[PDB]
Amino acid sequence: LVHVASVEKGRSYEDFQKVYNAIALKLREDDEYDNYIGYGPVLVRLAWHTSGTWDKHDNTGGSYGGTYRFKKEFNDPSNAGLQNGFKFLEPIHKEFPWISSGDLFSLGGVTAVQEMQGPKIPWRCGRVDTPEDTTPDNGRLPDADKDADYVRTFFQRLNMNDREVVALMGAHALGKTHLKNSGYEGPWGAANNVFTNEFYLNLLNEDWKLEKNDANNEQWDSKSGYMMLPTDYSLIQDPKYLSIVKEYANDQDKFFKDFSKAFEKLLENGITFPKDAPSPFIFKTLEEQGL
Ligand code: HEM
Numbered sequence: 001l002v003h004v005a006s007v008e009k010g011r012s013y014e015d016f017q018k019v020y021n022a023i024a025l026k027l028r029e030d031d032e033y034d035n036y037i038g039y040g041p042v043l044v045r046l047a048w049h050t051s052g053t054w055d056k057h058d059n060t061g062g063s064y065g066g067t068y069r070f071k072k073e074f075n076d077p078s079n080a081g082l083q084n085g086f087k088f089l090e091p092i093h094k095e096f097p098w099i100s101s102g103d104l105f106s107l108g109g110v111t112a113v114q115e116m117q118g119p120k121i122p123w124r125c126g127r128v129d130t131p132e133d134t135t136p137d138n139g140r141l142p143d144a145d146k147d148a149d150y151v152r153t154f155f156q157r158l159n160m161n162d163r164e165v166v167a168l169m170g171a172h173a174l175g176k177t178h179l180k181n182s183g184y185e186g187p188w189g190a191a192n193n194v195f196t197n198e199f200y201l202n203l204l205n206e207d208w209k210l211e212k213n214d215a216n217n218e219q220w221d222s223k224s225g226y227m228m229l230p231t232d233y234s235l236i237q238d239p240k241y242l243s244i245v246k247e248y249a250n251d252q253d254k255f256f257k258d259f260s261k262a263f264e265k266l267l268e269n270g271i272t273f274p275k276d277a278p279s280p281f282i283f284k285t286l287e288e289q290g291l
């Protein structure tokens with residue numbers, strides 16, 4: 001199967017800029033959510049979980065179809081907590097009903113990263129809604145208590161290499177883990193809603209102890225109050241991952257650049273862009289538009 005991108009009929013850059021804007025403003029205005037973290041991180045996760053189902057071998061899942069809107073995907077245990085992101089975006093969808101679900105879901109992540117001072121993430125449009133029968137089964141998203149060979153292996157199915165994996169992981173600077181959702185509890189860092197390389201810095205410069213949490217899973221905790229999933233901690237256990245973690249903890253700049261490529265790619269996996277499609281869009285932030 002091939003998924004051809006198909007621009008929403010007669011729409012162009014500034015149409016999408018308006019949708020960025022709406023999302024970016026609600027982000028600004030509902031800022032009490034999760035004890036002041038806001039919606040940015042949960043939108044980033046939604047963007048990733050809606051693309052992260054892709055299977056490179058047969059082209060199933062992925063961001064195209066917006067399948068997250070159907071009961072099966074929406075209630076995947078791996079998706080617990082994301083309801084809040086969909087619930088944020090539902091009113092934005094009603095105001096721009098002409099946008100595909102795939103475009104909304106993925107644009108949400110791109111907006112959230114920029115609005116949190118991350119790099120610009122070129123974004124392309126033309127995900128087309130597909131029917132309920134195209135929804136991938138549960139279980140394509142990664143288990144948290146696994147190791148480096150598990151993470152490398154898992155991410156091969158997304159066509160991501162070592163660099164992309166580590167870059168994309170740095171997204172764990174945003175938000176926290178929530179016991180009721182995933183069986184883990186605690187943020188990865190302090191600058192909870194600002195996109196930085198704090199993730200690689202905390203990985204390397206904290207003294208972690210392995211511990212049981214109240215759900216009876218183990219996680220690596222620091223005296224500072226931070227945590228790391230075993231998959232997170234695996235990135236310093238693997239010598240080839242360690243090297244790239246060092247690079248990013250060192251050069252926020254090279255990380256932003258790499259994350260930007262990986263995210264767009266992640267968000268576009270599975271999609272065939274016809275030869276005469278529009279170039280990727282780069283959207284202005286609220287601050288660039290004087291807010
Ligand atoms: C081995 C790969 C990964 C694993 C095992 C993993 C696992 C998890 C878990 C258990 C949570 C906490 C969920 C909760 O309790 O609310 C989480 C949060 C999060 N993940 Fe990942 N994740 C992975 C990769 C990624 C990627 C590739 C991205 C995006 C590029 C990402 C972005 C986020 C964000 C932004 C949050 C926090 C959401 C919030 O605070 O509500 N993660 N992840």
Ligand SMILES: [F-]
Binds near residue numbers: 045048
């Ligand atoms: F995640």
